[PDB]
Design a binder for this molecule. Structure first.
Ligand SMILES: *[C@@H]1O[C@H](CO)[C@@H](O[C@@H]2O[C@H](CO)[C@@H](O[C@@H]3O[C@H](CO[C@H]4O[C@H](CO[C@H]5O[C@H](CO)[C@@H](O)[C@H](O)[C@@H]5O)[C@@H](O)[C@H](O)[C@@H]4O)[C@@H](O)[C@H](O[C@H]4O[C@H](CO)[C@@H](O)[C@H](O)[C@@H]4O[C@H]4O[C@H](CO)[C@@H](O)[C@H](O)[C@@H]4O[C@H]4O[C@H](CO)[C@@H](O)[C@H](O)[C@@H]4O)[C@@H]3O)[C@H](O)[C@H]2NC(C)=O)[C@H](O)[C@H]1NC(C)=O
Lengths: 70, 58, 365, 146
């Protein structure tokens, strides 16, 4: 689903917003996010990740009569 | 044949001719109904192919 | 061609062991085979518009309950979707088999009937003269359908069928001799029997407009290993006694012709242009030299080699053909160079290759 | 079942006049030509005088010019004999068109019988009245210059 992507947003516990930039590693177009407060060892951070994929639900019968359902 | 078009009038009624259809029900052997407008003013029919198994299809 | 997966409906499972040779050859060519009873309430040849069986084989006479989704309309839609259906009935036809036959223009007969003949029957009959020995003389004679070798007298017992003369597509393969009448045995004759003459077809074939091969054979037993290994000698005094029946070779030829292996054609890219150019210009002018090219491939063992093409005719048609020429074979392409006529308008390049036993191909630009 | 034989007697078919009659035996054909017709033939059992009815008693016509064939059935009355009267104006549909020379065979057979006989009784003369091939090559007739 790497090509059928439309939006990827990342937030934090509560009301907040963050910044992600596309990165390349030496492949599935990995992203990296910059946290507001850097976490020390032994800490915990909640990060909400919301992605939207388009053109991913395919109609299986692919041909429906005027009186049938998808 | 089965669309009411008036108040005190039988179903298969034609406004312009003020009459009652002679053949209420019939089947189109060589035509499919491709489209029909909202008030049934323009009707587009798709001419059919030859019968696959080579039947008559009068 | 088509896919290798096929479905086999049976009258009873015993057919697996008594039709051993034919099924073994069929599997030897790579065709995957699934056997199911014709009265199974679980079988289905379509699911969400998929046609999950590419070929269908009906060896089940005396059936009236096909199953879950299999009906006569389902088999008709399967033949409309490119399927290849082979049926075989023998004196126990049954109403849906006859109805299916009537849906392809090949009428079967009553249940009790049998193609009877009293001049050419073999000594192994031991009955009411019903084991017909059809000679290889009266036969369609097309090397694509029936094979390219010489055969022996073939023998079968079953019901006779006639062709509807309204169908242009129906073809007759092995019509019986002018001595068969196909009436009730052991009952006197009152009416005019069904196909009393040489038009008792006995093995028919249908070539649909979408190139769907269907073979309606009578005589389920015609495919049985008992007829594959039995010598034939007509009861006429002192007839020649052949060692090999010559039924097996015919059967394999029919199977290779209905499952898209022996005769198949494909039309490749066409190209037309002014003589001395390389791309097609819109709106040719009157009396302008034009070159036409088209490629056809034949599927010999899957090679798709170039077709021979002795007589392929190009037609330059407006409403009725203005020009009609032959396509000279040159460098794998069929190219003709000709001058457009004086009459203007819109026109149609047309190629029609209807040959007996070959896939009907049609192309119009 | 028990075997049985087949025998033909009387015969003497005759040309119908809108009526001379001629007779022949079982081994050979009839000399001459007959134009319409009702061939009569009494089928009796061999070795013991009796009247039988074979299961198949069709009468066949073969046309040499076109190769077509037409078969009819002779149905008996209570006269212990058959009849095949050719109307020559009826049966227009069966004979789409007339050919000069027709060869007349007598196909006869049964399961109980030991030998089926089919020989041409006489020649008959009747005067009652592509889909996939290379099509004709057509060229274009250009207009003549002034
Ligand atoms: C307004 O609209 C109108 C309709 O939309 C337009 O009219 C149409 O115009 C065309 C062209 O003029 C007409 O076509 C011609 O009809 C001629 C007379 O018709 C015959 O009808 C019978 C045929 O019937 C059927 O026959 C077979 C049966 O299977 C079937 O395949 C066939 O399709 C048809 O359905 C026939 O039995 C009758 O006897 C009539 O003859 C007819 O002569 C024309 O035939 C020509 O042309 C066609 C192609 O155009 C060729 O395929 C033929 O072989 C034949 O060819 C001959 O003439 C060519 C040029 O004329 C030559 O190149 C050929 O070599 C060949 O030459 C021989 O004959 C010449 C004499 O004619 C000789 O000089 C030569 O030496 C050769 O011996 C053609 O079919 C339509 O009929 C007509 N439609 C209607 C409804 O009338 C009209 O044009 C529009 N107006 C304007 C201004 O454009």
């Amino acid at each position: 689903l790497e090509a059928r992507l439309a939006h990827l947003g990342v937030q934090v516990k509560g009301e907040d917003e963050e910044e992600n930039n596309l990165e390349v590693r030496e492949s599935g177009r990995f992203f990296t996010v910059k946290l507001p407060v850097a976490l020390d060892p032994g800490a915990k951070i909640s990060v909400i990740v919301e992605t939207v994929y388009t053109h991913v639900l395919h109609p299986y019968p692919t041909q429906i009569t005027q009186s049938e359902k998808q | 044949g089965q669309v009411y078009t008036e108040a005190k009038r039988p179903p298969g009624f034609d406004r312009v001719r003020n009459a009652e259809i002679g053949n209420k029900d019939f089947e189109l052997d060589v035509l499919e109904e491709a489209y029909t407008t909202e008030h049934w003013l323009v009707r587009i029919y798709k001419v059919k192919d030859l019968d696959n198994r080579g039947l008559s299809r009068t | 061609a088509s896919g290798p997966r096929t479905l086999v409906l049976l009258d009873n499972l015993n057919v697996r062991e008594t039709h051993s040779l034919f099924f073994r050859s069929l599997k030897d060519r790579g065709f995957e085979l699934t056997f199911k009873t014709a009265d199974d309430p679980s079988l289905s040849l379509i699911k969400y518009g998929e046609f999950l069986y590419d070929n269908l084989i009906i060896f089940s006479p005396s059936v009236e309950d096909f199953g879950g989704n299999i009906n006569v309309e389902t088999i008709s839609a399967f033949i409309d979707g490119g399927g290849s259906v082979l049926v075989a009935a023998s004196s126990d036809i049954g109403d849906p088999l006859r109805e299916l036959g009537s849906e392809c223009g090949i009428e079967f007969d009553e249940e009790k009937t049998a193609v009877i003949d009293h001049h050419n029957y073999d000594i192994s009959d031991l009955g009411q003269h019903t084991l017909i020995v059809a000679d290889t003389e009266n036969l369609l004679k097309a090397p694509t359908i029936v094979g390219k070798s010489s055969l022996n007298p073939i023998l079968f017992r079953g019901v006779g069928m006639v062709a509807d003369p309204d169908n242009p597509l129906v073809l007759d393969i092995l019509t019986g001799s002018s001595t068969s009448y196909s009436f009730f045995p052991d009952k006197p004759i009152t009416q005019y029997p069904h196909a009393v003459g040489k038009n008792t077809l006995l093995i028919a074939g249908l070539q649909a407009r979408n190139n769907a091969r269907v073979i309606f054979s009578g005589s389920l037993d015609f495919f049985s290993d008992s007829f594959f290994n039995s010598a034939v000698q007509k009861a006429a005094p002192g007839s020649q006694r052949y060692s090999q029946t010559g039924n097996y070779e015919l059967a394999v030829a029919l199977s290779r012709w209905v499952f898209k292996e022996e005769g198949v054609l494909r039309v490749g890219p066409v190209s037309h242009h002014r003589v001395g150019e390389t791309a097609p210009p819109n709106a040719y002018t009157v009396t302008d030299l034009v070159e036409y090219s088209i490629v056809i491939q034949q599927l010999s063992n899957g090679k798709w080699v170039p077709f021979d093409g002795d007589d392929i005719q190009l037609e330059f048609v407006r409403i009725d053909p203005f020009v009609r020429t032959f396509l000279k074979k040159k460098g794998g392409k069929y190219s003709v160079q000709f001058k457009l006529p004086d009459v203007y308008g819109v026109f149609q390049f047309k190629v029609d290759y209807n040959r007996l036993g070959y896939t009907h191909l049609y192309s119009s630009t | 079942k028990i075997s049985t034989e087949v025998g033909i007697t009387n015969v003497d078919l005759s040309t119908v006049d809108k009526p001379k009659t001629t007779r022949v035996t079982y081994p050979a054909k009839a000399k001459g030509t007959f134009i319409a017709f009702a061939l009569f033939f009494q089928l009796v059992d061999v070795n013991t005088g009796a009247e039988l009815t074979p299961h198949q008693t069709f009468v066949r016509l073969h046309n040499q010019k076109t190769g077509q064939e037409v078969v009819f059935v002779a149905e008996p009355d209570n006269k212990n004999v058959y009849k095949f009267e050719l109307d020559t104006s009826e049966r227009k549909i069966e004979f789409d068109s007339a050919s000069g020379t027709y060869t007349l065979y007598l196909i006869i057979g049964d399961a109980t019988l030991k030998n089926p006989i089919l020989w041409n009784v006489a020649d008959v003369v009747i005067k009652f009245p592509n889909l996939f091939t290379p099509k004709q090559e057509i060229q274009h007739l250009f207009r003549e210059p002034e």
